[PDB]
Amino acid sequence: HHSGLVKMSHPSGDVEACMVQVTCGSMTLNGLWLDNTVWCPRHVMCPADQLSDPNYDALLISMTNHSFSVQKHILRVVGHAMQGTLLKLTVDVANPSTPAYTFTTVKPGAAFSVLACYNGRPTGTFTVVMRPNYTIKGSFLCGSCGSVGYTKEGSVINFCYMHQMELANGTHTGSAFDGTMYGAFMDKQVHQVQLTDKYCSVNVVAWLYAAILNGCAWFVKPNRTSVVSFNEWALANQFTEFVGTQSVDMLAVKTGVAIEQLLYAIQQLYTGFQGKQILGSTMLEDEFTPEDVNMQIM
Amino acid sequence: HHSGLVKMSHPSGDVEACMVQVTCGSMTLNGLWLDNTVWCPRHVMCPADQLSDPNYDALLISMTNHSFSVQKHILRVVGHAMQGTLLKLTVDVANPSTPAYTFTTVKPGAAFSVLACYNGRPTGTFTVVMRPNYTIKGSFLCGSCGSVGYTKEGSVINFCYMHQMELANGTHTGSAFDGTMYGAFMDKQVHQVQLTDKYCSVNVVAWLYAAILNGCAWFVKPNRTSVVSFNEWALANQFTEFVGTQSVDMLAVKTGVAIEQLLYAIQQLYTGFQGKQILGSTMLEDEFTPEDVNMQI
Ligand SMILES: *[C@H](O)[C@H](C[C@@H]1CCNC1=O)NC(=O)[C@H](CC(C)C)NC(=O)OC1(CC)COCOC1
Ligand SMILES: *[C@H](O)[C@H](C[C@@H]1CCNC1=O)NC(=O)[C@H](CC(C)C)NC(=O)OC1(CC)COCOC1
């Protein structure tokens, strides 16, 4: 039986209307236009020559307002400032289609939608999970910097990601809109090695609950492992700490299966399913959130 | 090395601007507002009483323009007609934000984006492949009917799907905008026979080309299988006919690996990967198209 559990993104129309192109010298990339502000990665300031150790503080000082061209395809710069790894440009027109929005940094295990853009033009959207080593997968090519990641709750878009770089293992990372880089990677063209990744324990729990809701519960036993005990074990076996949420609790109430029975199951299943499948899979899946499962299976 | 091959959907803003809610008596679902026309599934006319064997001809005749209610959230009806499994409702206002569009019927193995909506409100977007048995997977709950699927060529939107139903096995189907149901399923709540699914051969090829581009070419051999022999083999082993395309050919040039080497490879991998993985998988993957791979790698 097909569960209906799929990778689902937020509808992108609200964010499409905020995308612009930003150009500084030879470098061109994407920006986010909210009210009188345009956000973009500060390495737009850097010519290809100096990208391997840029001096951003000096590059900023060398700019004037005319050093930045902002074009909408889908504007006069009247101020420029740097905030961590982002530029905050002030323009003289308020974006007439600005959504209600917040700037909240996301934590590992949380999912968000990405609007991939090139030269200020949206081309595709996908959902990613912020990994425990502060990278994301997804699909990003040359020109994609400034593409944004977001969630939506009610009318309020939460902007959580602005794309900056690809790592040698092909994963990606970027900034929060407070200017910090996820994982503290440097916006320098240099080899940087991401830390070891981990299974997102709370999302594995959610997926097992999706399995139960879908009629697949051969892995459920009476046996349990406490949260506190599971977390001691998680540290030493490449799992995140489990932190419960009202979203997980809803799934436990619906199924009648306790969180702690699934923490025991995870300790038995992460080595393999001994020939069985769970939701068409032979390994544990950690990129569906408790919210995904509540939204899509209930 | 993560390939960067992911399930990607089209930006949905153009289509979001066309979604409305359609209400008829006590039933409510989504509709697509293009110019002066609102498209929605005809079963909005059916009371819960009679979902098993609705008489859509008599239901239509019993309706008047005032039977229908159309609200834009993200309108007065002055005309109603039935086209196959869809209603075509004429409203007095023409949608100002109507994109350039066409209507197409997608074929098995082709990918399209779906804007899932509830009560006229877009809530999510995902990409599906029309399966060889004319069903799709995806995620659709109660209230999702009238959600639409589409591709793009340029800024042109090609509307190809309007969601209608879920089958006993959890898969889904819908209408093309000429009113025909994909796979000729009936818009009634009765058990109906679904053909067995098959691997979409051309997409498996594209997936192996993506593996090669990503530096995973252990399955590659100079052993070849002609398209014709492959096609013969595919009938007895639950695979679709391979049909080359310009898009596949590009991939054979980028990698310098011939189609027939991968056809040969498919025959062997179907019997097993023999301890090895391909792009993190131990089974063949057939929901990534040649166009996906060309665009994403
Ligand atoms: C901005 O559009 C760039 C996006 C990456 C290009 C390929 N895929 C991407 O996601 N970002 C960069 O090019 C970035 C600039 C520095 C932070 C100053 N460098 C980068 O992503 O690094 C490499 C590998 C070390 C990525 O792969 C291509 O070579 C550069
Ligand atoms: C319209 O929004 C409905 C969408 C489905 C409901 C649950 N998931 C869906 O995709 N469509 C229907 O309710 C449909 C109406 C008939 C075509 C007249 N019924 C339906 O999808 O079939 C059932 C039973 C075969 C699927 O299983 C649950 O009950 C409905």
The shortest C-alpha distance from B150 to chain A (Å) reads: 13
Rounded CA-CA distance B69/A77 in Å is: 47
Give which of A99, A111, A139 is closest to B288, Cα–Cα: A139
Contact assignment for A125 to B13 by CB distance below 8 Å? no
- The residue type of B47 is P
Rounded CA-CA distance B40/B30 in Å is: 6
Distance of CA A72 to the CA centre of its chain: 25
Unique residue bearing structure tokens 């300031």: A45
Interface of A with B (CB under 8 A): 1-14, 16-17, 115-116, 122-126, 137-141, 169-171, 282, 295-296
- B165: Cβ below 6 Å to ligand 2? yes
List the domain range (segments joined by +) for residue A228. Answer: 201-297
Beta bridge partners of B172: B136, B166
Catalytic, A43? Answer yes
Give which of B219, B192, B124, B132 is closest to B163, Cα–Cα: B124
Residues of A in contact with B123 (CB under 8 A): 11
Contact indicator for A227, A240 with CB cutoff of 8 Å: no
- B174: Cβ below 6 Å to ligand 2? no
CA of A114 to the centre of ligand 2 (A): 31
Contact indicator for B119, B21 with CB cutoff of 8 Å: yes
- The residue type of A221 is K
Strands A27-34 and A37-41: antiparallel
Burial of A173 (0-12, 13-18, 19+ CB in 10 A): buried
Give which of A94, A91, A66 is closest to A78, Cα–Cα: A91
Other CB atoms within a 10 A radius of the CB of residue B106 amount to: 21
CA atoms within 13 A on the CB side of A171: 21
CA of B165 to the centre of ligand 2 (A): 4
Dihedral sign (CA B268, B136, B151, A97): negative
Residues of B in contact with A125 (CB under 8 A): 8-12, 125
Contact indicator for B44, B142 with CB cutoff of 8 Å: no
Contact assignment for B8 to A171 by CB distance below 8 Å? no
For chain B, the distance separating the N- and C-terminal CA atoms, rounded to the nearest angstrom, is 13
Other CB atoms within a 10 A radius of the CB of residue B76 amount to: 12
Q: After which residues is chain B broken (C to N over 2.5 A)?
A: 74
Length of chain B: 297
- B286: Cβ below 6 Å to ligand 2? no
- At A282, which CATH number? 1.10.1840.10
Burial of A90 (0-12, 13-18, 19+ CB in 10 A): middle
Chain A residue with minimal CA distance to B13? A13
- The residue type of A35 is D
Rounded CA-CA distance A213/A217 in Å is: 8
Chain B residue with minimal CA distance to A139? B4
For residue A266, the SS3 value is helix
Vertex B243 angle, CA B237 and B244, to 5°: 130
Contact assignment for A124 to B9 by CB distance below 8 Å? yes
* B148 phi, psi to nearest 5 deg: -120, 150
CA of A287 to the centre of ligand 1 (A): 24
Contact indicator for B115, B60 with CB cutoff of 8 Å: no
Enclosing H/E stretch for A251: helix A246-255
For residue A103, the SS3 value is strand
Which bin fits B154, alpha (ψ -120 to 50), beta or left (φ > 0)?
left
* B199 phi, psi to nearest 5 deg: -70, 135
Q: Helical H runs in A56-200?
A: 56-62
Rounded CA-CA distance B47/B55 in Å is: 11
Other CB atoms within a 10 A radius of the CB of residue A250 amount to: 16
Question: Three-class SS string for chain B?
Answer: CCCCCCCCECCCHHHHCCEEEEEECCEEEEEEEECCEEEEEHHHHCCHHHCCCCCHHHHHHHCCHHHEEEECCCCCEEEEEEECCEEEEEECCCCCCCCCEEECCCCCCCEEEEEEEECCEEEEEEEEECCCCCCECCCCCCCCCCCEEEEEECCEEEEEEEEEEECCCCCEEEECCCCCEHHHCCCCCCCCCCCCCCECHHHHHHHHHHHHHCCCCCCCCCCCCCHHHHHHHHHCCCECCCCCCHHHHHHHHHHCCCHHHHHHHHHHHHHCCCCCCECCECCCCCCCCHHHHHHHC
Beta bridge partners of B281: B278
Long-range contacts of A192-198 (CB under 8 A, 24+ apart): A192/A167, A192/A168, A193/A167, A193/A168, A194/A133, A194/A134, A194/A135, A194/A167, A194/A169, A195/A133, A195/A134, A196/A133, A196/A238, A197/A131, A197/A132, A197/A133, A197/A135, A197/A238, A198/A131, A198/A132, A198/A133, A198/A238, A198/A239, A198/A240
| Tokens linked to B277 | 């993985």
Unique residue bearing structure tokens 């053909």: B195
Rounded CA-CA distance A209/A123 in Å is: 34
Contact indicator for A146, A41 with CB cutoff of 8 Å: yes
Q: How far is CA B283 from CA B45, B182, B276, B279, in A?
A: 44, 27, 10, 10
For residue A209, the SS3 value is helix
Give which of A52, A32, A56 is closest to A42, Cα–Cα: A56
Burial of A276 (0-12, 13-18, 19+ CB in 10 A): exposed
- B141: Cβ below 6 Å to ligand 2? yes
* A230 phi, psi to nearest 5 deg: -55, -40
Q: How far is CA B178 from CA B30, B54, B58, B90, B195, in A?
A: 18, 20, 21, 16, 23
Catalytic residue (choose from A18, A24, A145, A160): A145
Give which of B27, B31, B35 is closest to B19, Cα–Cα: B31
Contact assignment for A4 to B137 by CB distance below 8 Å? yes
Q: After which residues is chain A broken (C to N over 2.5 A)?
A: 74
Catalytic residue (choose from A143, A146, A174, A183): A143
Q: How far is CA A31 from CA A22, A81, A121, in A?
A: 6, 14, 10
Q: Which atom of ligand 2 is nearest to the CA of B187?
A: 17
Work out the widest C-alpha separation in chain B, in whole angstroms.
Answer: 68
Dihedral sign (CA A196, A197, A201, A204): negative
Q: Ligand 2 test: best mutation among B45, B52, B165, most atoms within 8 Å of CB?
A: B165
Strands B19-24 and B27-34: antiparallel
Beta bridge partners of A201: none
- Experimental method, per PDB record: X-ray
| Tokens linked to A232 | 């001691």
| Tokens linked to A89 | 């440009």
Rounded CA-CA distance B68/B82 in Å is: 13
Rounded CA-CA distance B121/A37 in Å is: 29
* B123 phi, psi to nearest 5 deg: -120, -20
Strands A101-103 and A156-166: parallel
Strands B37-41 and B86-91: antiparallel
Chain B residue with minimal CA distance to A13? B13
Q: Which atom of ligand 2 is nearest to the CA of B29?
A: 2
Edge to edge, the sheet with strand B19-24 lists B68-71, B19-24, B27-34, B37-41, B86-91, B77-83
Contact indicator for A23, B22 with CB cutoff of 8 Å: no
- B172: Cβ below 6 Å to ligand 2? yes
Beta bridge partners of A40: A87
Other CB atoms within a 10 A radius of the CB of residue A290 amount to: 23
Contact indicator for A257, A217 with CB cutoff of 8 Å: yes
Other CB atoms within a 10 A radius of the CB of residue A133 amount to: 18
Unique residue bearing structure tokens 């492949």: B129
Radius of gyration of chain A (CA): 21
Angle of helix A246-255 versus helix A290-297 axis, rounded to 10? 50
Contact assignment for B116 to A171 by CB distance below 8 Å? no
Catalytic, A145? Answer yes
